[PDB]
Write an enzyme that holds these catalytic residues in place. Structure first.
Site, PDB file in Angstrom:
ATOM      1  CD  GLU A 215      -6.908  -5.277  -2.008  1.00 40.21           C
ATOM      2  OE1 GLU A 215      -6.689  -5.422  -0.656  1.00 40.21           O
ATOM      3  OE2 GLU A 215      -6.293  -5.404  -2.896  1.00 40.21           O
TER       4      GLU A 215
ATOM      5  CD  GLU B  26      -2.408  -1.327   2.587  1.00 43.75           C
ATOM      6  OE1 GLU B  26      -3.757  -1.676   2.617  1.00 43.75           O
ATOM      7  OE2 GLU B  26      -1.769  -1.360   3.758  1.00 43.75           O
TER       8      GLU B  26
END
Ligand SMILES: OC[C@H]1O[C@H](O[C@H]2[C@H](O)[C@@H](O)[C@H](O)O[C@@H]2CO)[C@H](O)[C@@H](O)[C@@H]1O
Ligand SMILES: OC[C@H]1O[C@H](O[C@H]2[C@H](O)[C@@H](O)[C@H](O)O[C@@H]2CO)[C@H](O)[C@@H](O)[C@@H]1O
Ligand SMILES: [Ca+2]
Length: 516
Positions: A367, A172
């Site tokens: 997600e 991320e």
């Protein structure tokens, strides 16, 4: 969906592969069987981490793409597509990390200074990924790795649907502000990660570059710094988060802190496009973490997001747009709490991100943050995905559904759907000038009976003298819907008499015609 629209026509469902090598958790033959079962349940592709620690383990330019190529062959054998993640981050140490794959150890020897790693407010050193500040090393290594990977995957370009880049911790784009060792795990406030001597000097030179001199800096911040060495990041993180952030210094520090992530995005994006564009011609994406805790904390607003580097989401998203990267966000399965001590607002976060992405014309994917074991969570993911224009959803993770037929079937029904275009025609609608017509139905794709913000708008066809619309529905699913009129002021005037249904929605395009 939001703003009279329907589900995104390009919606696709994906599945995350295990964290370990297939051979450790199973065998190639069975894996291929699994992939065929997954496809049977609406999954279009499998996303997989290809660890930097595996591909360039022994030394600089000593690549090993054998596992990756072997993996690709089985995906091709199963008749599936794959989405590789060039994981330049460490596996192990984060939530759900059943693995241990550090980044190449020889990389840390490249520098004599602390430019490569992170250091928190309290001096906790983090090395699960390279510090975005060392752009010179990032450029050399990622360019080299991206180009090498491209060459090795050239033969399998046919089964590669998209490519994910790793923007930092856990893949991320953020700072490692929430770790157990640093004592900043959920739901605690995060700590800033700019305390390496290298990070301090960069901020200082950045400030001096903006103002020119300490005299202009002091003049801009309303401070009385005697020396340039006094220009430093927040010595007290909590105080900074309480009110320090409101000052000119606070604005400047947060601008730089987040700016480092934006420049990183543009760098890895440039290298990626240069490496993969001509050969694969597939979309490239990156991920933004879902730091939902300490969101609506009254004393320290967004006390977890800021230290992670997320201060201005709109500004952050402009970086993805300019770098030509698709964005992926998590937490689709969660709901708002916003109560002490966590102050968790996951749903609100997602809605804001989605709205920003959508207004900026950025392709959005989602997600689930944690494993799902109940259809209820799938339902929430469905509400967000189909109502907030998500282009795709990636289920975490493989084993959860692969070894549970019941859960797998519920996923198929709710999320493993194929969007098909259909024309809905309603006759005899008693409208008055200013009246607009809409339809809403049971499934999340139809707005879940909501009439406020999720209904799908219909339009008047002057030629046939009726109301109709090209609505995207889930193919082969039973749906129940009803049309309704909305007065000029935005209130429901009336409802269609009989409830309509399509059992099921045809795989082929046609039209459902009914009277008011
Ligand atoms: O770089 C100047 C000083 O910055 C920090 O002090 C900030 C503080 O973190 C912030 O919360 C408050 O609002 O403003 C002061 C500066 O006005 C460092 O903590 C100092 O050591 C630096 O000298
Ligand atoms: O396999 C992809 C990545 O999965 C994990 O990271 C997840 C994390 O588990 C999840 O809770 C969060 O919402 O999203 C991240 C990123 O998708 C691993 O920890 C990563 O190393 C993997 O790259
Ligand atoms: Ca290299």
């Amino acid at each position: 969906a939001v703003n009279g629209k329907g589900m995104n026509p390009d919606y696709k469902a994906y599945l995350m592969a295990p964290l370990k090598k297939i051979p450790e958790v199973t065998n190639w033959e069975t894996f291929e069987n699994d992939l065929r079962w997954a496809k049977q349940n609406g999954f279009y592709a499998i996303t997989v981490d290809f660890w930097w620690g595996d591909m360039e383990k022994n030394g600089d330019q000593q690549f090993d793409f054998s596992y990756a190529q072997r993996f690709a062959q089985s995906v091709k054998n199963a008749g599936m597509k794959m989405i590789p993640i060039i994981s330049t981050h460490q596996c192990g140490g984060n939530v759900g990390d059943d693995c241990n794959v550090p980044i190449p150890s020889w990389v840390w020897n490249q520098k004599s200074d602390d430019s490569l790693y992170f250091k928190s407010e309290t001096g906790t050193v983090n090395k699960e990924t390279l510090n975005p500040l060392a752009s010179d090393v990032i450029r050399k290594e990622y360019g080299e790795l991206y180009t090498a990977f491209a060459a090795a995957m050239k033969p399998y370009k046919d089964v590669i649907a998209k490519i994910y880049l790793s923007g930092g911790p856990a893949g991320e784009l953020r700072y490692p502000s929430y770790t157990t060792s640093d004592g900043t795990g959920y739901p605690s406030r995060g700590k800033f990660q700019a305390y390496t001597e290298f990070a301090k000097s960069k901020f200082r030179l950045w400030v001096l570059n903006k103002y020119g001199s300490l005299n202009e800096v002091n003049k801009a911040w309303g401070t009385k710094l005697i020396s340039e060495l006094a220009i430093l990041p927040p010595s007290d993180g909590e105080q900074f988060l309480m009110n320090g952030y409101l000052s000119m210094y606070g604005k400047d520090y947060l601008e730089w802190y987040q700016g480092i992530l934006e420049n990183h995005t543009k760098l890895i994006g440039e290298l990626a496009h240069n490496a993969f564009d001509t050969t694969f011609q597939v979309p490239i994406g990156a991920k933004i973490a879902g730091v939902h805790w300490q969101y609506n904390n009254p004393t320290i607003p967004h006390g977890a997001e800021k230290p992670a580097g997320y201060n201005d989401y709109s500004h952050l998203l402009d970086a993805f747009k300019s770098a030509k990267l698709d964005v992926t966000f998590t937490c689709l399965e969660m709901t708002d709490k916003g109560s002490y001590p966590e102050y968790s607002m996951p749903k609100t976060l997602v809605q804001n991100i989605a709205t920003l992405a959508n207004e900026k014309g950025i392709v959005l994917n989602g997600e689930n943050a944690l494993s799902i074991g109940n259809e209820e969570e799938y339902k929430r993911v469905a509400e967000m995905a189909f109502n907030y224009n998500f282009a795709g959803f990636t289920l975490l993770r493989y084993q959860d559904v692969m070894y549970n037929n019941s859960l797998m079937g519920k996923f198929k029904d709710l999320l493993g759907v194929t969007p098909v275009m259909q024309t809905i025609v309603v006759k005899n609608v008693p409208t008055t000038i200013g009246d607009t017509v809409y339809i809403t139905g049971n499934r999340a794709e139809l707005g879940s009976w909501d009439t406020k913000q999720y209904p799908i708008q219909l339009y008047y066809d002057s030629h046939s003298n009726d109301w109709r619309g090209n609505v995207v529905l889930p193919a082969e699913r039973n749906i129940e819907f009803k049309a309704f009129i909305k007065s000029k002021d935005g209130t429901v005037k009336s409802w269609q008499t009989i409830q309509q249904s399509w059992n099921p929605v045809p795989l082929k395009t046609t039209s459902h015609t009914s009277s008011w």
